[PDB]
Design a protein around this nucleic acid. Structure first.
Length: 1335
RNA sequence: GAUGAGACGCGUUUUAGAGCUAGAAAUAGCAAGUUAAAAUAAGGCUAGUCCGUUAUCAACUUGAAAAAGUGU
């Protein structure tokens, strides 16, 4: 009667299976709706949903913001036009109208063809006089002559539209703008980050060197030449090299495995810096920020060589002229044959390309460099083709550096000069400047009025907000409050409680204590290294951490242990080299206020937390400044400004109430209190939280479905997978007659080796690598890798191994397969005979460790083995395996650490368990189990239920099934261990209590909980223990596993050829088209950029994106007779067209050219709609004009296992006795290849229909029949890409590359059967489209 | 580990920047070029200095919609 659901949640699929008490997969009959002759199908309740990955809302956000900016910029220019209106109407009635219509061709143009003046003569004159806008800007700033009001507008507009950046806050002065001051600022931050090996900025004239009109690398060399202790490739060297615009690599500066090459002038820089900071710490932020600021200062110095900008651009125009004329002259002089290509052909990256073709400065310089090197009359030109000042346009990328204060300046100059000639410029000068100056603050957000899902702000008036009445119309206070209310992230650990800023004092204390409390100190006077205890820790903090930003091991041992704990010789085992933790904000704000009194007062702590909070949330000057209102008196008004200048960015992961708020029920000590001072054995935040002895865990445990999902901490993709999972379960509940299941099992699916082995072999006699060379091509073959991690010696006996005889040697497990399944290197060794470990069922013998420990420690120093491996190798020296270690093994094997999974299990529980008893207690009908993937995967490998993902999509379903099997079998065999994997408030039962101290009620002595599936249990000795044929639970009498029948049942389920694979059908969403604006062309294919703008004249977009195709049955006109021919067509509705179509489809279709449309036969066909054709061949709809493979090749499980085994000829299992037999199983079945290729062939000939590629791959197969079995196998695993579901893709078989075979015709589906599938695929609705037509 | 607010600078597309000599023209010889306006998802009603590329979506039935139903 009862049943269970097994699930395998993924980002691209959801596996699901239904099982019964005998571990069988039911088969049922389902109705088939539609209009075919089929009315029922028999289907197995096993299957998998497939779906495209969910996307992150970023690109959508970037677009949103960019849109906002364009509207607001246009609004600016519209303000400026609003001011100049009347007087311009007095001067030129149709100036602005000429401006709007600047775009239109002369034909569509209502007014005179020339925008500025309205006459050919005045226009040509104007352009001849001022070849650029900058000339005119300079003339308008420097001359006292009255000028045409139109040129006033044009200048002011060209300065208000493009109003420069706003990075520098307040007015411009040398302290924030000049190369030198920012250089000493940079070195100040660097020195602050080190203080040891510092840099002096005293004798360095950086202002002259960095701003010199010489190349970047030259300025680099010149600067590092002034620094003797530093090299060009140094950290500082790469910082300046970064600031000049070069591309330094920080791989060498910080010993990373991967290279990290930064370049400020790239769009991807922000993220690359993010990765760099991820790998080296958040201590280096201000440094790189300073480096950037310096870069902008340098660039601004390169462009500003009154109106300095306009002037320099003018000089640039002139230089461009001189160098161009000289260039052309020289070219005609030396190569007249190539002049026509360089100055006329736009298709080439020449000047004709640089100006008309669309090439960039870089492409241009790349093009003409070899020519200039071939002409040899061009040395100064080549000199110019560097340093970024040759043939330059006035508008390029460097222009980002120009602050808004420059433009405000020149704008103000022009405004002052013509101030007297026009009273309205005088009266409205501050208005204009405000238009240029005003910038909406972060905390304000979109100036909405209730119709924005993003905005929050509040208005003081009912007026349209302008840059002039902004200040007293926006409720800055309420808006800031709401801004706070929104931006506060809550702690996942503690909801309803916001998280501390990443730079809060409490947070820094927290991380310091957390990293410090795990330090163990050892001295000769003491027996063994233990922790520091409270007095010592607080002492180290008080003396060291609040006097120094960076703490050195030398500073720890010599400036504490030597001067307090008397210890002369100490050894620290807790931390390496230095402390990662720090008290940065403490020391920075200390340097700010210079008042240790308020700092350590502990009463002022709250006030400080509020101060740093405000400094983190906001960045606007005024809102920052309002944060002095409560704290103006408490501090001297002098220091206060320096406090306002300090800004902190970033957020923590933990709240206040979690760190120092919530406290244990019993002990009454909070997390921080219980962390600061423990007894001899210290507790970490990793072990305080999930501990069952304390209140914390139970405290952590204590809305709509959408909210439940969105609150989760996971990618939008996995949230998609999770919603699909919930839906699948709901439908499966519907299929089983609305009966909820017993159980729902959930599963959620390198040079480092070479580095460690070369470093490690370097720490010792490195003769092994010099005598036996090896590259990472030999990679990580286990036995070789271990042969090198062990210096070519036996880990158990003192003897020098041989490379040529590795196949005789076997790998052994430190903690045997009987206790814990661990196949990593951290639990594997290499020896001539596994018998050399000893004769114990436990860890290797005492005889061995006592005779080999020295060697092991030798390996430990060389970091060849980790602490864990050394500990587990020398465990007989402490007895062996204990009860704590076994309880540990259980908790390791059984607990899923991932929090997303616990929250998904919580969701399904909250959905399935809805009934309450006579008390007020949760009636728990359905048990939601959580599985680790290692369980089912190892279960596969143990009993040869092998997985080969490349064959078909069944493995998802098989995985959900096996998840149900192992999950429920575990809940039946070990019910006491429920609270460790089943979701809910159960009893803990203290795992330690469930394990036997020695053999012969207890659950197990051998802690591999997955032992009871086996008939035999092989021990370290080779001693083969035996187990019942039928496993049953003691205290219940229930039978859990029949090692005879149930494996046959599983093997049966996995081999069922009918699995419900369903691909979620999806309306396409996104951009209307490709984003490139194409030149005007005589085609009716281009899309209008604006309603009226005919693309044949103005250009437009290409390649629109189709939302979904639609089936239309109607008639069209054919011939000169315009006779109605009835047709049935597949029409794609594009994303742009969609709103209009769905609003009223019949008029859309009639306007499209269709007459007498069958409204009831308009069938919506989303992407991946399924069509079945002849012989059971299927196709999915990819667009309105291409199809995808729709069938699944169900390869018999024997072939699958054969392919797994043969492809893994180098099988690293657990035994070498069975492995050889596996290899013999491969060699014995060589006909299997031929059979497999026969299956692939039959399937191919029937459903994929690619005759060419099949013939090619068949010939290429039969030709290589004499090739080894392993090769043929893995190549066939490739060959499966011919038959795979989805889009055709190219694949390689041996050397022969088989190109993809697309299905470009879409018509065949018009007379096929549309199959509407539910999410399980169990419910179908089949529509015969050949029955539909024009009567 | 997702989600959000502010701003810049490129790019691109049309248009304005009279091309000149011969030759009747076709077409060849040459002169040049660096700038600007405008748009920057078509657009939307809720008309905001707002919103418009995420999430969500088999079929059928009932609903304006949220969403309920339908198949041993």
């Amino acid at each position: 009667k009862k049943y269970s659901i097994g699930l395998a949640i993924g980002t691209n699929s959801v596996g699901w299976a239904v099982i019964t008490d005998d571990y069988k997969v039911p088969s049922k009959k389902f109705k088939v709706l539609g209009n075919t002759d089929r009315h029922s199908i028999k289907k197995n309740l096993i299957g998998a949903l497939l779906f495209d990955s969910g996307e992150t809302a970023e690109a959508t956000r970037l677009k949103r913001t960019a849109r906002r900016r364009y509207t607001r910029r246009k609004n600016r220019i519209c303000y400026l036009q609003e001011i100049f209106s009347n007087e311009m109407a007095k001067v030129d009635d149709s100036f602005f109208h000429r401006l709007e219509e600047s775009f239109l061709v002369e034909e569509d143009k209502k007014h005179e063809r020339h925008p500025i003046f309205g006459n050919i003569v005045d226009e040509v004159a104007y352009h001849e006089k001022y070849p650029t806008i900058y000339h005119l800007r300079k003339k308008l700033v420097d001359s006292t002559d009255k000028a045409d009001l139109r040129l006033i507008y044009l200048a002011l507009a060209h300065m208000i539209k493009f109003r420069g950046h706003f990075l520098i806050e307040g007015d411009l002065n040398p302290d924030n703008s000049d190369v030198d001051k920012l250089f000493i600022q940079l070195v100040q931050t660097y020195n602050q980050l080190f203080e040891e090996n510092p840099i002096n900025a005293s004798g360095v004239d950086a202002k002259a060197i960095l701003s010199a009109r010489l190349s970047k690398s030259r300025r680099l060399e010149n600067l590092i030449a002034q620094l003797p202790g530093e090299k060009k490739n140094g950290l500082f060297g790469n910082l300046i090299a970064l600031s000049l615009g070069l591309t330094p690599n920080f791989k060498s500066n910080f010993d990373l495995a991967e290279d990290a090459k930064l370049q400020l002038s790239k769009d991807t820089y922000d993220d690359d810096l993010d990765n760099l900071l991820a790998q080296i710490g958040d201590q280096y932020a201000d440094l790189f920020l300073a480096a950037k600021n310096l870069s902008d200062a340098i660039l601004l110095s390169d462009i500003l060589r009154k109106a300095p900008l306009s002037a320099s651009m003018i000089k640039r125009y002139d230089e461009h002229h001189q160098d161009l004329t000289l260039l052309k002259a020289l070219v005609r002089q030396q190569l007249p044959e190539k002049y026509k290509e360089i100055f006329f052909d736009q298709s080439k990256n020449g000047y004709a390309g640089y100006i008309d073709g669309g090439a960039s400065q870089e492409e241009f310089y790349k093009f003409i460099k070899p020519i200039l090197e071939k002409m040899d009359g061009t040395e100064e030109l080549l000199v110019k083709l560097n340093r970024e000042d040759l043939l330059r346009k006035q508008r390029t990328f460097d222009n980002g550096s120009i602050p808004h204060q420059i433009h405000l300046g020149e704008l103000h100059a022009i405004l002052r000069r013509q101030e007297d000639f026009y009273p309205f410029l005088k009266d409205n000068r501050e208005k204009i400047e405000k238009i240029l100056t005003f910038r909406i603050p972060y905390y304000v957000g979109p100036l909405a009025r209730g119709n924005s899902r993003f905005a929050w702000m509040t208005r003081k008036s009912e007026e349209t907000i302008t840059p002039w009445n902004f200040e007293e119309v926006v409720d800055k206070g309420a808006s800031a409050q709401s801004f706070i209310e929104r931006m506060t992230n809550f702690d996942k650990n503690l909801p309803n409680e916001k998280v501390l800023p990443k730079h809060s004092l409490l947070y820094e204390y927290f991380t310091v204590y957390n990293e410090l409390t795990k330090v163990k100190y050892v001295t000769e006077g003491m027996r063994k290294p233990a922790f520091l205890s409270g007095e010592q820790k607080k002492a180290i903090v008080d003396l060291l951490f609040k006097t120094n930003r960076k703490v050195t091991v030398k500073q720890l041992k010599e400036d504490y242990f030597k001067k307090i704990e008397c210890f002369d010789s100490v050894e620290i085992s807790g931390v390496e080299d230095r402390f990662n933790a720090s008290l940065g904000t403490y020391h920075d704000l200390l340097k700010i206020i210079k008042d240790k009194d308020f700092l350590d007062n502990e009463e002022n702590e709250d006030i400080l937390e509020d101060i740093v909070l405000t400094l983190t949330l906001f960045e606007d000057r005024e809102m920052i400044e309002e944060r002095l209102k409560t704290y103006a008196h408490l501090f001297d008004d002098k220091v206060m400004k320096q406090l306002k200048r300090r800004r902190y960015t970033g957020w923590g992961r933990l709240s206040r109430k979690l760190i120092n708020g919530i406290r244990d029920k019993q002990s009454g000590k909070t997390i921080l209190d219980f962390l600061k001072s423990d007894g001899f054995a210290n507790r970490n935040f990793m072990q305080l939280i999930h501990d069952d002895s304390l209140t914390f865990k139970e405290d952590i445990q204590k809305d709509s479905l959408h909210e439940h999902i969105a609150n989760l901490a996971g990618s939008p993709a996995i949230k998609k997978g999770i919603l699909q999972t919930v839906k699948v379960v709901d439908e499966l509940v519907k299929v089983m007659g609305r009966h909820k299941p017993e159980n729902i099992v959930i599963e959620m699916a390198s040079r480092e080796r070479m580095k460690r082995i070369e470093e490690g072999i370097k720490e010792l006699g490195s003769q092994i690598l010099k005598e036996h060379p090896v590259e990472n091509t030999q990679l990580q073959n286990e036995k070789l890798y271990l042969y090198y991690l062990q210096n070519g010696r036996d880990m158990y006996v003192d003897q020098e191994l041989d490379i040529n005889r590795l196949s005789d040697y076997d790998v052994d497990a430190i903690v045997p397969q009987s206790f814990l399944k661990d196949d990593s290197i951290d639990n594997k060794v290499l020896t001539r005979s596994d018998k050399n470990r000893g004769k114990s069922d436990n860890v290797p013998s005492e005889e061995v460790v006592k005779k080999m420990k020295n060697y092991w420690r030798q390996l430990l120093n060389a970091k060849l083995i980790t602490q864990r491996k050394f500990d587990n190798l020398t465990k007989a020296e402490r007895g062996g395996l204990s009860e704590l270690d076994k309880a540990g093994f259980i908790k390791r094997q059984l607990v899923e650490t991932r929090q997303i999974t616990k929250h998904v299990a919580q969701i399904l529980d909250s959905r399935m368990n809805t009934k309450y008893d006579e008390n007020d207690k949760l009636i728990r009908e359905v048990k939601v189990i959580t599985l680790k993937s290692k369980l089912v995967s190892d279960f596969r490998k143990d009993f040869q239920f092998y997985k080969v993902r490349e064959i078909n999509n069944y493995h998802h379903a098989h995985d959900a099934y096996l998840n149900a099997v192992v999950g429920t079998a575990l809940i039946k065999k070990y019910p006491k261990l429920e609270s460790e994997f089943v979701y809910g408030d159960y009893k803990v039962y203290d795992v330690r209590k469930m394990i036997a101290k020695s053999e012969q009620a207890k659950y197990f002595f051998y802690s591999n909980i997955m032992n009871f599936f086996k008939t035999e249990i092989t021990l370290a000795n080779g001693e083969i223990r035996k187990r019942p044929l039928i496993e049953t639970n003691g205290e219940t009498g229930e039978i859990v596993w029949d090692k005879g029948r149930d494996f046959a049942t599983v093997r049966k389920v996995l081999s069922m050829p009918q699995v419900n694979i369903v691909k979620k059908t999806e309306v396409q969403t996104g951009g209307f088209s490709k984003e490139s604006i194409l030149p005007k062309r005589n085609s009716d294919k281009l899309i209008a950029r604006k309603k009226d703008w005919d693309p044949k004249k103005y250009g437009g977009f290409d390649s629109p994106t189709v939302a979904y195709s639609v089936l239309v049955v109607a008639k069209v006109e054919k011939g000169k007779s315009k006779k109605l021919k009835s047709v049935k067509e597949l029409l794609g509705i594009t994303i742009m067209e969609r709103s209009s179509f769905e609003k009223n489809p019949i008029d859309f279709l009639e306007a499209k050219g269709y007459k007498e449309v069958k409204k009831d036969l308009i069938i919506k066909l989303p992407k991946y709609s399924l069509f079945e054709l002849e012989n059971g061949r299927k196709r999915m709809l990819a667009s309105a004009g291409e199809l995808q493979k729709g069938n699944e090749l169900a390869l018999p499980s024997k072939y699958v296992n054969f392919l797994y085994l043969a492809s893994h000829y180098e099988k690293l299992k657990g035994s070498p006795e069975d492995n050889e037999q596996k290899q013999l199983f491969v060699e014995q079945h060589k006909h299997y290849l031929d059979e497999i290729i026969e299956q692939i062939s039959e399937f191919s000939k029937r459903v994929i229909l690619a005759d060419a590629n099949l013939d090619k791959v068949l010939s290429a197969y039969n030709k290589h029949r004499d090739k080894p079995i392993r090769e043929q196998a893995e190549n066939i695993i490739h060959l499966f890409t011919l038959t795979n579901l989805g889009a055709p893709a190219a694949f390689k078989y041996f050397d022969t590359t088989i190109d993809r075979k697309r299905y470009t015709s879409t018509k065949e589906v018009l007379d096929a059967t549309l199959i509407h599938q539910s999410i399980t695929g169990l419910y179908e609705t089949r529509i015969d489209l050949s029955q539909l037509g024009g009567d």
